[PDB]
Amino acid sequence: FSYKGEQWLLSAEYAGKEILVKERLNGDIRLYFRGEEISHVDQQKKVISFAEKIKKKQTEMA
DNA sequence: CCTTCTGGGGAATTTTAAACCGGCGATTTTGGGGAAAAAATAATCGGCCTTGACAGCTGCACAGTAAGAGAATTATGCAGTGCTGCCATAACCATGAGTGATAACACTGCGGCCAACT
């Protein structure tokens, strides 16, 4: 999905469903799906391209 | 025994309070003109969010009706030929009018001759 020009990668269960992003004025993004809370997206100051996110998820699943 | 004092009541008069109506002074309001600001509306800009497609391609089959393409057949219009009659034209002569021609001068076009350059 996308948020303010940055694209995030969720897991299988979340594909094809509507999540709710909640962003404090502090500057931290929290993803709430179906009332519950899902894993944090380790938001970073430096923007990383979708390709780098795919590579990171690939290495993590490896 | 008598005199004087006092009190009540009706009439006349005076003063002050209240209410209305008018006059006078002030602010408000309406209208027009000029400037400034706000808002509304439309157009243009950037960007985010989300999803469709790209994955060999589409031609054929059936249903009913209508059209059309080709070939055979039929109808009709043109053409061809013969005989007779009528209308047009043409041929000649006369007279009038238009144009082609002829004379003369002036300007221009074409052919013969001379010279200059390569």
Side-chain angles (χ1 to χ4, degrees):
Chain A
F1 70 93
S2 61
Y3 192 77
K4 289 172 65 175
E6 288 186 11
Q7 292 165 319
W8 303 111
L9 265 165
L10 293 188
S11 302
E13 179 182 344
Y14 306 136
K17 299 179 180 300
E18 221 180 10
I19 75 188
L20 176 51
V21 195
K22 306 190 179 174
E23 187 182 16
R24 299 177 179 175
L25 266 65
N26 169 28
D28 294 0
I29 296 169
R30 305 154 297 171
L31 297 60
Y32 300 81
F33 170 64
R34 195 166 291 179
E36 307 290 40
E37 170 64 8
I38 78 193
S39 180
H40 189 245
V41 300
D42 62 288
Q43 184 177 4
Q44 187 176 4
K45 55 176 287 186
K46 313 101 180 175
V47 305
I48 58 183
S49 182
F50 201 119
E52 291 295 349
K53 297 175 194 172
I54 289 167
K55 190 194 294 294
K56 194 53 51 182
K57 193 186 216 303
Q58 170 181 329
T59 53
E60 166 271 324
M61 293 298 298

